[model samples]
Target chain A: DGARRKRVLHDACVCGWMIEFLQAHYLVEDDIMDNSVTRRGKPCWYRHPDVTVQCAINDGLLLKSWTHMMAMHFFADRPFLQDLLCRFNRVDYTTAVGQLYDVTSMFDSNKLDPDVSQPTTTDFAEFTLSNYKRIVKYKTAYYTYLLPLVMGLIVSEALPTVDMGVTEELAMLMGEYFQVQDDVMDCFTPPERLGKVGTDIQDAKCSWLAVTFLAKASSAQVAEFKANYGSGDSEKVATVRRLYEEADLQGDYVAYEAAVAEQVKELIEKLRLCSPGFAASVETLWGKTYKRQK
Target chain B: DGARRKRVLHDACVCGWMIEFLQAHYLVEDDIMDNSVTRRGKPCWYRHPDVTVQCAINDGLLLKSWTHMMAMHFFADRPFLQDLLCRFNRVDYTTAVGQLYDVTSMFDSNKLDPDVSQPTTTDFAEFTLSNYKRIVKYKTAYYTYLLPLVMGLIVSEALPTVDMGVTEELAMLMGEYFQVQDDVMDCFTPPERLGKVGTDIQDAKCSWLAVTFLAKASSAQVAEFKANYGSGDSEKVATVRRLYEEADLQGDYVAYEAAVAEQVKELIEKLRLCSPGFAASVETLWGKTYKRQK
Candidate 1:
């Protein structure tokens, strides 16, 4: 028991700093991209008087690079060091591309470049459920859910042996569910609870709730939504919020959450047969996210 | 000789894409940081209507990550794969920190965080030649001069055998030389020849010429230089330009360039005894930068 406790403590420290640094780097840059004012109830790093956006951009970059170097240093002796790096690089690519998708998907199609030869940016017409899932999976699932699980498995020497494809699928399911909760919480949760203001509607992020409302709304409501969303006006934000309630977005979210959890539980039961450790890890992850209000 | 020619062509293709991709990535982010309008006679990627600053941020990220992934794929079978990755990540950290140094070093010490306990940003007090060399070595030399040579040695399987410290030292020396050249080129070269407008004075870059002028100027001229430099006005730029002439910075640059080249050639001569390959590569590199117009 002492050995288990010691090993877990060390590995936790290892993963904790890496994850926290990556999270901090993302938050700093994300705040700049969205022009958000606050994070974790403090002025976002970019907004701090000492470190404006100019310095914060380099700071974020420093943090990510530092994280990579530290990981390499710590994992220097590990046999799976090469594979660990490959995973890290892969996640970096996927998450950055996902971020690109989320940012590019919001530009008004009407405002695109006049030159037809230019590579297309995502527009409203491309804002379908399929694209939304891609954004969520790449931006959130891969890094948030899968990377953690995969890193743990690799560090513990349990990867590349079994069918790791299942781990990715499970992470995708959990990631989507977690993101939905995040989208719902952003609107419903207060700054006091969430520690940040919700700018999804105003920022025109590819929120699951936004995708849902549009899918279910009438043409009139859709037109209203289009005009009101992403304008960064308080009244416009309120208008979009009203439309979501009018379309029962909360109800849809609850149903979706329940169904996602059910499917995951079913998956875990089968996973338990092949790999009890994976099942247990998933359950622990699920428990952490189940009905969480941050 | 045909087989030798074929091998050289093959290695060139491999290194070319990796270097080009890295350059493109750095330029995209650099343009954003400098807020420059044009690059090589065209609108910077982030300036294009199709991909604004927001998308370009992610684009740069995507480019770097893609480059890493492609390298991993290409070098999948190489025995030195782990070492190759270590070098890449180390440069990423050093260069990003160098960028942090260059960006943070320019902030007014008088305007840093009011809290005395805050981590210090580099200020006027730290802008001496010592700090300038650090900035150049990390920001420019590591990636621009050293990384290419190191990568060539790595891909060709010559790394980790001989003393690499000498290689890095040479890189630092050459990097400083290359950067001084760049500093001069920005101020002296016309847009027609250079294909980019100079913004060093306007952007308040930590320029070699500025450092030299300040070091040599009288107290009164130093005061005048301070008031005129970094003001972003065309007349201020011209005033700073005039001060450089008054100080005969051109003579200083010519002297610095010659000393640096002589030192490099001397080092190359010693290097020839142990590694003619290294010496030859250094000579080739020196030729490329010798009075390069662009």
Candidate 2:
């Protein structure tokens, strides 16, 4: 408990502050749009009767501005830092475009239809998985895991001439494993244990769970899933859960997890051939991420 | 108009991306929170009959996650980008704290008393001005005027010594003037020309216009304002507007504007003693800002 508390405090000092700012910039917009009444343990920042939804939009923009200002402050002296900012800009632009694709995909009935649009079941599974991977790669991986480690390493000023390809390959593999592990945990983890409900089915999240379920399910099971998975009806959710159990979907997920780990190990080996220090750091980080419970 | 458009596209590319992300995040969340049917130019992101609100929340979070990830990608490598990000974290935290304060202030009924709460006529003007200054500094000044300019300057690596005091003082004066000018414009600017009606009265904004109106109003005018200022009633808003006009508040605002400009000039002189580059840059910038039509 003390260790966890210390970790929380450290995060509050560093990662937490960054996260909060990011939330202020990004999540406040979501809260305004979703009309959420609360965030974390408090009422949503934009929920005040006087602060109209319109003004909240301005506040969100300011959050973005603050972020730019912060980055400028941190890395003003280093051209490398500026290059990274440029890279971040490219990644950010690409991510936004990917999000546009994701949003449009949701609305286009053809995209969601497995048989009519997907060509084959494998095609459907592959398309869905690719989308999930792209979303996570652009949305979570670059920032949460890669950026923090990169920042630490960069500030240390070691390995001055590392190739971009090697760094990216290692980061991408680690990121993918990190997200897939999260999705598997989401569906299986209980509230008393996890302290939150998983969004896998509830949100139609393009998660590994959905992709795995779709990949493994038979025609009858697929039909059952179509009826139950996206349906907000409580009974439908319960039915879907039972169906997944009948399919031994959880066991399949366990096997899939091991396959991903093996693939990741291979990637790490490739990375080590170029730079063992980079490879080792990534593997150790991935190892910790692979076993994370919450 | 074409030249203006080009300039807008050039300066506002990042701003545009930021806004679009903000909107996407908002629609997803809003659809869930209000169970709303429409947003912006389309059906809300979660408007489907089958999708649950919880799904929308998840979608919102996902979108937000993407935005931050993009931010990290674009900005992570800048020389002082990390510092900027850190400062942004502070600004974000400060703004959230300020929002909390504003929210708390709204529910503070003690500030609403006739004898004990509302200030006496002489003190009322000062009280209202103080309120205006506080809001503008927290809400508008730090985020808008100061943030972008500071980011640009820091990233340019032109002012590397971190003597923020010189620039901050100049920024604060300019920020105050800009805010006051905005308030004055809001009161007098015709809606057809201005493009939107002012909601300051309805929102009970602690604006200087309201303060000045109270200070200059006759007994009847004060009564008119007191009854109408915070009320949602359209007729009350109309009455307050008429009283403001009748009191020649616009002319008063013009004189106040002149006085503030002169005061800022004096502050700029002080700024010049420490940093002529910052002062001169601010003057040029403020010249454009004060003359902006929209």
Candidate 3:
């Protein structure tokens, strides 16, 4: 039994590496588009002295092409090859769609006049948050959490015995929480610890913090945000930081984190009712990120 | 008989459109890497007012994803679907490899000092020409000619009836001729006729003309070439043009054309000896490009 389990674990590791391979490509391309200078405490791939933008594109393609090569080598003779290819393609397309939405939305917002009245809470609830949720679900949820989990199940031959719907629901919940945590960290974390200075406000990104701050802000606060947000001036950045503090966003995040944690626990319990082994796997996955920092 | 012919023609049209769909994506991304301003007499996709480089990446992915969607719709029930998917992936990889070679070679050449000795005829034959051939075979030949022909055969259920080796050989030959024709047209055709000014010389492309010029040039001619080639100055461009005229390159091209045409005719004849119907289709394919001008 342990021998079989060991084989499953090995396959899971392979699948995880495959996912990372795909993600590395996305990260390289995303860094170029976002004008990000560093990732994981190092210069972004395109920023290397020897790397040109053209080479970066090819590098991304090389990373993506390796996934197919790996699939052909390891899964070619298996009946699951077709399933794996289809799932991989779906995940890739979903991620691209999410990226398209995110980029286009940022472009659209960039064109808007900052002096225009800030979006009301109802508007935030109706348009901004929904769009945010859709982006997170498609971009982060499918590829980051669900793909690895499902791939592991597929490798272990446990997919046929698992409740995919429950698994997906929980994974998506985790993905949303993960992004929220990232947003919180972007503003709260020290630059040295985070490896890059936070530029979410200056970049005009639709961060979770921004949406919530807008949702709770008064007229004077909204004016202050409009003046300070997306400005490069150090004093303006400080003004926005003070607004976040006055809005009690840190307190809000703690409450939000607790709520998501409770939802995840409930979902895991539901999964346990269906498949105890899957529930244990899900718990192991959650444990890795439950208290994650930079 | 007429009904069967119509069905074959319809399937061929579908395959043609599939190839075009894939090409649109490649062109968009390539234009960005090349920093091209326009395509098809309009702004390149990435150069469009509303489009960013990020969206262009997604657009390419969208185009590629459509191939799978179309395959699932039309060929899903057929056993050839897996083969088709595998072939598509291989073609994409081959094209990317060619692009990688082309981009990196340019980068390498860019880094070389202009004061360095011009490559001799032997260097032209051993290095430049061989690299050009590799780039042409992978970038243009496989996708442009071989892929469509093979895809048509697969769709018509005639792959088993035809000798693929003969078909591939003929297609590759045609692809080489097509690229040579493109290179000739770039310099010979007017900007109005070509819809864009020929920038091959200025862009420092590994054009057939460049390789042949280097192979045939004497020491003084090579010195003149080094001074004039890849220069944006009008006089330098005229100098290069005069050198081409003096070198009798136009006569050389005419002879090259005749040789490729003769080879194609012989290949078609061999194909005819194997399958008369396939021979007719091959003739129809060649007819479109035999005397192409614009």
Candidate 4:
């Protein structure tokens, strides 16, 4: 009796390892794509003298294969093994799609046609905001927020009874909140606290700050932004940051954060009605991200 | 009855599309890693002015997601859909492992310590040949030669009864043979006929020629190879070619091809006892690769 329980616990732990491995694997490749020099104040993997870009690809692939090996080793005898595998594929595929959309839109916005109408604040708001949510939901929210909870449900054999629609709805909202806070902290937090200087301005990321400022800027301000945004020059980045202050974006973030907190509380109450354990998990997630300092 | 048949044909056609899409996806990423400028006599996707290396990552992800979309649309209701998906994941995972081995080995060979004794022909043969076979088997054999055949079997509902062990054994052999032919053509075929200049030497590839030469070369010849191989200079390439001639590698390739042909014939005869249709398919596969000229 003890032996079977021990085996079950062991398998669940292996599954947890697989998920973390995949997250790191994707980050290794993402760092290369982003040309990131440091991660968490340490040299990124590809920046090491011994590691080349070719090895980065292989490393990602190696990590991906371990997931399959884990599944085969620990879960092969289970009836839900195939189901779990499919779910893993679906999550990974969704994340990839989100990344694709995010990357392509960045490139697309960079090539704004000189002949077309100068992008008005309305145009920027509509395009950037929609794409921002898409990226947050698919890229961050699904894999980072929802996946662990779903995995718990799967391992506990509660997946059949739980309403995944509710889980996903709450998870995505929480993920969006997490990303918006990240954007806010990128500008507000010191490099000593955040671990690295934020490059979102230079990288031309579709950050919440950028979209909100774009929506509120004048035509002259929009023109200035088109010139200053995504520039490598420190002065240009400063100008963009100053413009955000002029627009009172920090106050907007506080308001936005409070609203998200309220919405999350409401969602958790609904989750409590469905499954108290899930509600508690949501509360734990909120505690981790809510008003995060770093 | 006709409608059902049409839908089956359509789904099979979509599977074919998916296989091609994945090939193109992997090629896009591979080309970037190799720093290849052209593919099939056209500018590589990453080489286009509007496209950046970052976008290439997303494009690959986009192509990957399409396979999932295809499965959801065409195979969602099938009892064996999950099994087919798991098989697809396994094949992809195997291919990724092959790539990892191939890329890392190239980097590993580059950093050979100067203070150590120069790699003997024996050393090169032992290390390179084993890895060369592993790369070919996993990277090219499974995804290129075996996957479509297996997909065909799966879609036809023949997976349950068919002897996949026999199928994979033959498919891998055929794949190994196909890669050897690629290695042969890289050196022997002219750029005009092959459609691109061969860079296996400059790229430091663990090619069939390289391993075969190492297995046969004297210590002096091995030293010459270490000097002349992987240099961008044409004179170095020419010297390496002369050394290859001294080893009579072309003759070795011809003899190797004949042996592989004989082995395939024997394998097909064995297959005939199991399934005449599969044997015919094996024969057709052989016909596509045997004694082919560009």
Candidate 5:
């Protein structure tokens, strides 16, 4: 067993490094596209004085290559190596599709500012809760929640043969729940604590709070939301922030998060039925971000 | 023979589609990075009225996904499917590294208008023929030439057990040869025939012609070359064009092309010794681009 543990853990470490580099790769590219100045308490790679956008692109692509090459080398004799490689590629593909959905769904009234003639009634329409769930599932859930779990199980040869679908649902639900909290945190949490300032409002992002507000807003309120939201102007951003306060969006999130938190208990029970140890392992992770401030 | 041929050709088509999509995917991405307006006589995907930079990124990712997915499906039972998948990822990785080399090796005078304080003596230093060959091999050769050949051999179970290295050597050599022709086409080929107007000079690209001219430049010639080589001004571009003409860079290229062509014959002979039929197949592909103007 000790001999097996060494081999198993070594393979696990390789898998860990692959996914981590892959995440770093996407972050660098995403930073360039989002025009983000900082991530993780420091300047983004592209924001470095010597680095250009094109330079960052190469860095990101290399990060991705690192994952594949590592897999090729370390897993050369492993039976399930193909599964791990496919999972990496498939996740990479889905995450980008989700990002596309996220990008196109939002409005950018800033770059080449268009006239305010067309109301963001359409933007609100597109920013539905349904779409938000899809975005979270593909963009956040697959990579953030599901990928590591699946990869871990594959490497260990512990993937449950039956009722795995329910756990996948469990991952998706938790991911969707996590992102809604992120949406709230983006606004309610201060920049000092949030790591990066919230631009969801400025970027016209479809967040749980925004959609919930729209679901219940009066016509005049909706019109004001359309006007003040998504603007590059700081005063406009401030107005949108106040509107969230006035509507008590934080109050709404508390209820939504509370509901998801409750559902997760029953979901965990379902997972525990099929994969008892795995279900046991997730509680600590779930609680870590249950009501996270950052 | 007929039964085996049907199965083989079907697999061949799958490989074709995968690599084709991979190429298309890279084209879309490179278009965005290069800021080029047209490709193959049509607007770049990122140049479309509806597509933002973010949208094109997603599109490129999906095209890449198609290649991987196609391979996963069609070659699931093939003994060497893993080999094919690894090749795709490796080439994808190498190509980006090459593009990074390509992007950083040159200067961009148009973006943000840097003062002429830097003579691009540093750029010239970085843009040696040795480096040019590397950029061509990584950026152009891996995907453009070697990937398809390697993937085909894997899928068909036709890969030579020995002397495969020489065949690989052949692919890289041909790929490097093709790209120098491209650098020339970027300058010398007619715009209507070339489909996209050449901006390599304005982009401050490290081309064979540029390196060739600099190799022989006197101190004053080098100063004037630096002064005029990478400017956005049309007159400066014209002056550089005249400088290329004054030195008979095309005449130099004719000799270089002749030399590379002569070497390719012996290289093909070496490949033919290892893989007879495969070597026979490359002549047509080689000749198509030998003196290609567009």
Candidate 6:
């Protein structure tokens, strides 16, 4: 208990600072609107009697600003630190914007799907994919995977020597795979294994799996999904799952993720044969990100 | 109209690269939450039919990221730029924290006593005044006024000499007074003269005028205000105005503002005699700020 308490305190300290800092940057107000009860099993920060909903949003914004401040506080003397801070700020902003997009896709099926519903299906699909890629590249990839190493590279001021083009492509591909794996695991994995109930369906997330399923579903299946998805009815979810299985959506996702991995591995080999220095960093990155389940 | 158009273009040009850059940071989900039909009369970037709401939010995120990028792009190569960026980033964070406090206040009536009902005659007036000052200083002063000038000062890498302290103080005092005057004008000025509708009631803002009026109002007048404030009914607003007049609140504000101006002038003279180098900048700042009709 003591050890767990210590770990909790350490994690809280880190997360508290991050939450406080993010409050400054994101202007996160929807949590209040969404009526979130808890974060990490504790009453949501905004839900605390002492904190108002608007204040909670302010906290998200603050976290973002704090992130920049943390970087500046540590790196003020280092010019490269400033550069890194700038990039991180950009990434933070991008992630938040992407989050906004993700939230909006919930109620509007038309916005979520253009292929069957809208006239500008191809254009919308391309735009949506580009946005998805951008989110992965800027929002998740830069922070979760890229920035840590980018910070190292920038700190060394060996930026020019870094092959950003190859590195970015590789990271993006991995980020895509990582995200798809996350979506798959989120719904399919058990609560005991995943440690949290998957809320993707409840939240109506436009994830790769969902998009792929929609793209491949027959007309009747699509109609059924539209009626059943995000209804918060267990029976309806079971029905949707049955329909998805009938469509082989799960197998399709498996194939899709496998293809992504194969492409990334092939890319790594190409990089290694061409630039050993860059290839080594890519390998190091892959080792850190390839198996993340949460 | 032409002049306004040119100003818009110039402002847009300065901010256009910023907007595009910010768009890149958008997350698709978050766009839906922050959804608006338009920003500055243009369709909200993420609200475009081709883009999901998540994409729009990502765009907003990118805008913020672009903010830093543009700052760095413009100034990173300069010797003093990194430090300046750090200062701006801190102010940005601080302002965000202030915003969180404000948003949190929205749902908590305990934190916000809107003048709908008047305060008790014996209420602690200074406590209200302090909160009002704290809000303005955090939300506006540092970010809106101090940051730009400080940025220029940092860019120049010339800290004001000891003699300039008096002038800096005078400038800061003027800035505070300038904001107070804005609050005062907003309450009393007519729309035709003011160029905008009074938004205090709609925003539930705890303005200086509201605090001062509440402090001076009679129990009966306070009761009338509480019953009618924030009702959005013109008749209610007019009734509250009548109570504020009965309490002589406007006269008190005029006298208070005059006294503050005299104090500012005294400070300016002190600076002129003691810190001549900073006088011109401080005076210019004051002239621009105090030229407002209140």
Candidates 5 and 6, the one with greater DockQ: 5
lDDT of 3 at B51: 63
Q: Best by lDDT, which number?
A: 1
Candidate 1, residues A1-294: lDDT per residue as tens digits?
698667656765786678778878888888888778778878778878667556687788888887778878776776777887788778878888889878877765566662323433233676679888988898889889888887787767777554577777788999988888888878878877888888888788878888888788898898888888876889999899899888998888778889988988887887787888778988999889878887
Candidate 1: true interface contacts recovered: 0.56
Ranking by lDDT: 1, 5, 4, 3, 2, 6
Per-residue error at B10 for model 2, in Å? 9.7
* lDDT at B270, model 2: 75
Identify the runs in model 5 with alpha carbons over 4 angstroms from their true place. A107-123, B107-123
True contacts kept of each: 0.56, 0.00, 0.30, 0.35, 0.43, 0.40
Local distance difference test values of all predictions, in order: 0.79, 0.58, 0.76, 0.76, 0.77, 0.57
Docking quality category of candidate 3 according to DockQ thresholds: acceptable
- Candidate with best DockQ: 1
Where does candidate 6 stray beyond 4 Å?
A1-39, A42-50, A93-135, A154-166, A189-205, A226-241, A265-293, B1-62, B100-127, B154-164, B191-204, B218-239, B273-278, B291-294
Predictions' DockQ, in order: 0.51, 0.09, 0.32, 0.35, 0.40, 0.28
1 or 6, greater by lDDT: 1
lDDT of 1 by residue, B1-294 (tens): 698566545664666677778778878888888878788888788777667676777788788887788877777777777887788778878888888777766765566672222443233456578778888888889888887887777766676654576777778888898888888888988877887788888888878987877777798877777787666789989988888888899899888888888888777776788887777878899888877777
TM-score against native, each model: 0.93, 0.62, 0.88, 0.88, 0.93, 0.72
Candidate 6: tens digits of C-alpha lDDT, residues A242-274: 776688867887677678768888888877775
Worst 10 residues of 3 chain B by lDDT: B118-127
lDDT value for candidate 5?
0.77
Better of 1 and 6 by DockQ: 1
> Better model by TM-score, 5 or 6?
5
- Count clashing residue pairs in model 4: 0
For lDDT, candidate 3 versus 5, the one ahead is: 5
RMSD of 6: 8.2
A1-294: candidate 4 lDDT, tens digit per residue? 897678667767887887888788787877877677677776677776666676676677678767877787688688777667668778888888777656555444554442332322323434467778987788778788888777777777778666677788889988998889878777778877877667778777778898888877799888888888876799999999989998899888889889998988987887788688868877998899888887
For model 2, the stretches where C-alpha displacement exceeds 4 angstroms are A1-105, A109-127, A161-164, A214-232, B1-127, B137-178, B184-188, B214-233, B246-248, B261-294
